Design a protein around this nucleic acid. Structure first.
Ligand code: CL
Ligand code: CL
Ligand code: CL
Ligand code: CL
Ligand code: CL
Ligand code: K
Ligand code: MG
Ligand code: MG
Ligand code: MG
Ligand code: MG
Ligand code: MG
Ligand code: MG
Ligand code: MG
Ligand code: MG
Ligand code: MG
Ligand code: MG
Ligand code: MG
Ligand code: MG
Ligand code: MG
Ligand code: MG
Ligand code: MG
Ligand code: NA
Ligand code: NA
Ligand code: NA
Ligand code: NA
Ligand code: NA
Ligand code: NA
Ligand code: NA
Ligand code: NA
Ligand code: NA
Ligand code: NA
Ligand code: NA
Ligand code: NA
Ligand code: NA
Ligand code: NA
Ligand code: NA
Ligand code: NA
Ligand code: NA
Lengths: 55, 174, 95, 165
RNA sequence: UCGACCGAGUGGCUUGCUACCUCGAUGUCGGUUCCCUCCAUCCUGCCCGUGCAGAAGCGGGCAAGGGUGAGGUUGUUCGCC
RNA sequence: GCUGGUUCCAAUCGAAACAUGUCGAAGCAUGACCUCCGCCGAGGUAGUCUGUGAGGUAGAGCGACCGAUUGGUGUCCUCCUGUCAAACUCCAAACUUACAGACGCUGUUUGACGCGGGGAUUCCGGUGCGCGGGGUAAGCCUGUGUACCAGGAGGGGAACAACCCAGAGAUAGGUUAAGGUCCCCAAGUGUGGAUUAAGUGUAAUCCUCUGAAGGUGGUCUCGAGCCCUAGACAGCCGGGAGGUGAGCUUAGAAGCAGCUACCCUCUAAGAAAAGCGUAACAGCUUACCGGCCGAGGUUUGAGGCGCCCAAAAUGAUCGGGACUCAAAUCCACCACCGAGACCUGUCCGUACCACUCAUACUGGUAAUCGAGUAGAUUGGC
């Protein structure tokens, strides 16, 4: 199952927004994959990552 | 990803473990193709190269495996052939095949013969100042050709003045 | 400090804002205080007389009596009781 | 040629007051205004600055080598009368000491030179150019940032959309 | 091939700084003899470039296995020959 | 006034390594600070809040003074433009501080706050953190506030005065803290993701754990623009024509020595030529067009981890073994191990309370008692 997540994280100059898809079997677990992934790939704290909508 | 290589006509391809063997009228070539999480298999008339991994390093090896196999197709049917030409200025160079090695006498007037040993099933055929290097495995043939040229290398003198040697002239395609 | 005089390090505390410069208004120089009253000690840069040692700027003492026109004000410096002789011009009533 | 490791940090109090400091050497900086001085900066479509990424002291000899190697490039490329201007915005106000000539007795240094204090994120150089010459100012700045202590950012502050695409 | 200015470093062989260790004493300099080591390589091996025709070089890379000696002045280390 | 030594047990309190004077700086006196005794008799103020006051450091700014410090113009000349300050200030904190009230805590049999007297010890200090001043720097010199070592155990940290937890009577059962859970070694070869291939790393702090400027189509992730099935990007094939060898220059200057111009036709398209090349023409490409092929391409911004930069002396290391979808790193999460801390039974000491001639008994209270060098006080062998 594919959920798409959109939100934004702090950046140089303006804040930057993304859209991301994950294979998690839930809307909660899909959200925590983005938290987990961006934590790894961007060295970002979970509080820094702000999520607007999960679809 | 997945890539499918249709085996051509009058060619057989067998895969045992990480080894793949290709047989044709011109001969047989076996290759080890080994990279993490890339599966190479023979399904019917089509050879299949696939992985669950999409990363740049994986794609690199996939593309490499494809070209390796296709080259094997070409080698067992059409064959692989390198052309070579001996040039000398002052000292006549004698280039012959003796057994499994090609031997070069009187290079730059040298008393001592230079030798290189042919790789695999590769054939070296000399006609006058022309050579042709040929066989089913492009690895073996290409290297045998290269070794012949490399064998006439000179480090200590100006190469622009001292040009004697055997050189690759024609290089294969497809 | 490079010297031990009483005006050492007083550049700020003994200087007016340029707007408050010039003769100070007489009303506060003639102010009358009663024994027991709490007063704040602040030297007025424009008034030369009736001053106290600059170390005591900012003290709040208790008026205990008068000596001539000056007041005798009791303060505690650290743990030590002292009596300061100071005119109304440098005194303001607490609250 | 004393190394900048000696002078580059902001560890010291600001020491600028010429009324209390004598024998200050002259600056080696030739000019703070380069290219076309009679022309306004705002006449140009493109504005590019070299930004310092760490708070540091850059001494006057380093400012000059840096400025020189950047302006020499512009002149070599856009031409001596070429259409552009470059500003070195900072001046070397901070006076430098060395304890030379006793050891640590009476160690307060004699006056050896000057440096400019630059906070991280500030514009050291700003160049104003025509769109065609913008890669030439980027290149001048690359040479310039090699001659000063800190790592630097090259920033196009006006007319980036016009550049390349 | 040489390479200024400016900028960033590494070493711990000089010199300086510090005064942490020893003043109920850790025997000086230079030399000698005998052992081990480091590499930033002088030669030797294998290479690259050349303003590499050759020969003779110059510059650079890998590399510490072996070698790097005898004499005249000076206590000299160093250095000069 | 300098070095060495000064002999039994226990209980309470518990420093100063600083200020002033000193032929004083290896000493002393006087204060600060420690302790003991007598007196006084109800307030006290280590925290916070509020009110009434003090202040000019950080920051900031300067046509607000002052002094530094740019350039360009308009006839020394009231705009514009570039910078600063420990000994500048039109501004201006956080914060420190005087006094009062309130709450808190404390004191009135444990007498506080204070007064008087006896006895000292001490006046080589050190470290961390914050703020400093000097110095290229220092395991450097010299301040300042604070907590710690000194005189502070026990648990971590490989070891290790001052880094983390932690302040500690005896004994006993628990549960945690710091820090750990692949083995050495008590507890996970824990879970959900992702990154790294460098054994990077497995190194909080540090003389102690280095690694910099400058590089990186190594790799991962997130954007922005443009092009593309009316076929993009690349490759391969074909075509790159005529006026014409443009004019000038020149002996000849033919796309391509130089000056100037840079028109025009045939076209699907092709420069008065972008680069090699020739003595000059050959000759090879580029622009530009068509075909084959078929799905992304291209420019650019940001981030993560790694790579290069990277040379030392007896035997290489993260404490060691060794570890690679980790036993590394980042984002989360789950269960555990693990102190003398915390909880809990009994006992001991000390202080206090009740009773008493007397803790000699007996009973009671301590969340608000239990570490200690120098030293003061007191019971005992
Ligand atoms: Cl007074
Ligand atoms: Cl001898
Ligand atoms: Cl304690
Ligand atoms: Cl290893
Ligand atoms: Cl006893
Ligand atoms: K000694
Ligand atoms: Mg030679
Ligand atoms: Mg000895
Ligand atoms: Mg080497
Ligand atoms: Mg050896
Ligand atoms: Mg005793
Ligand atoms: Mg006892
Ligand atoms: Mg005393
Ligand atoms: Mg002041
Ligand atoms: Mg300031
Ligand atoms: Mg203060
Ligand atoms: Mg001691
Ligand atoms: Mg175990
Ligand atoms: Mg390592
Ligand atoms: Mg660190
Ligand atoms: Mg005790
Ligand atoms: Na006044
Ligand atoms: Na002296
Ligand atoms: Na730099
Ligand atoms: Na030294
Ligand atoms: Na001794
Ligand atoms: Na000796
Ligand atoms: Na060697
Ligand atoms: Na000699
Ligand atoms: Na002292
Ligand atoms: Na003294
Ligand atoms: Na003495
Ligand atoms: Na109270
Ligand atoms: Na500050
Ligand atoms: Na303590
Ligand atoms: Na330990
Ligand atoms: Na390692
Ligand atoms: Na004691």
């Amino acid at each position: 199952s594919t959920y798409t997540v959109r939100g934004s994280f702090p950046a140089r100059d303006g804040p930057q927004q993304f859209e991301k898809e994950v294979e998690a079997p839930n809307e909660n677990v899909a959200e925590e994959r983005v938290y987990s992934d961006f934590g790894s790939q961007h060295n970002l704290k979970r509080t820094q990552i702000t999520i607007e909508e999960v679809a | 990803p997945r890539v499918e290589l249709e085996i051509p006509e009058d060619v057989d391809a067998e895969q045992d473990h990480l080894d793949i063997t290709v047989e044709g009228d011109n001969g047989s070539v076996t290759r080890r193709l080994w990279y993490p999480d890339i599966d190479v298999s023979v399904d019917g008339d089509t050879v299949v190269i696939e992985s669950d991994e999409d990363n740049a390093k994986t794609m690199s090896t996939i593309g490499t495996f494809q070209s390796h196999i296709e080259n094997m197709f070409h080698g067992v049917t059409e064959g692989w052939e390198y052309g070579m030409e001996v040039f000398y200025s002052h000292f006549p160079m004698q280039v012959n095949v003796e057994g499994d090695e090609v031997v070069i006498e009187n290079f730059l007037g040298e008393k001592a013969p230079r030798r290189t040993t042919i790789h695999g099933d590769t054939d070296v055929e000399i006609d006058g100042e022309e050579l042709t290097v040929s066989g089913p495995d492009i690895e073996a043939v290409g290297q045998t050709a290269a070794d012949i040229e490399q064998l006439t290398r000179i480090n200590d003198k100006d190469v622009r003045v001292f040009q004697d040697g055997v050189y690759i002239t024609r290089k294969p395609n497809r | 400090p490079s010297s031990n005089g009483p005006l050492e390090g007083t550049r700020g505390k003994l200087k007016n804002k340029p707007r408050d410069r010039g003769t100070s208004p007489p009303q506060r120089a003639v102010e009358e205080f009663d024994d027991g009253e709490k007063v704040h000690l602040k030297i007025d840069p424009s008034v030369p007389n009736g001053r106290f040692h600059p170390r005591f700027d900012g003290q709040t003492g208790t008026v205990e009596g008068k000596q001539g026109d000056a007041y005798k004000v009791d303060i505690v410096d650290g743990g030590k009781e002292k009596t300061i002789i100071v005119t109304a011009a440098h005194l303001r009533r607490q609250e | 040629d004393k190394p900048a490791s000696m002078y580059r940090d902001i560890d010291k109090p600001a020491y600028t007051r010429r009324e209390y400091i004598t024998g200050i050497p002259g600056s080696k900086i030739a000019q703070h205004k380069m290219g076309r001085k009679q022309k306004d900066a705002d006449d140009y479509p493109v504005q590019i600055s070299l930004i310092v990424e760490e708070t540091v002291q850059l001494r006057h000899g380093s400012l000059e080598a840096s400025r020189l190697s950047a302006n020499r490039h512009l002149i070599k490329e856009l031409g001596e009368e070429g259409d552009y201007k470059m500003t070195l915005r900072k001046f070397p106000h901070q006076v430098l000491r060395e304890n030379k000539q006793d050891g640590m007795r009476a160690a307060f240094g004699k006056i050896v030179g000057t440096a400019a204090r630059v906070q991280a994120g500030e514009q050291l150089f700003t160049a104003y150019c025509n769109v065609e010459d913008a890669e030439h100012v980027k290149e001048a700045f690359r040479r310039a940032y090699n001659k000063i202590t800190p790592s630097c950012r090259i920033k196009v502050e006006r007319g980036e959309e016009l550049l390349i695409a």
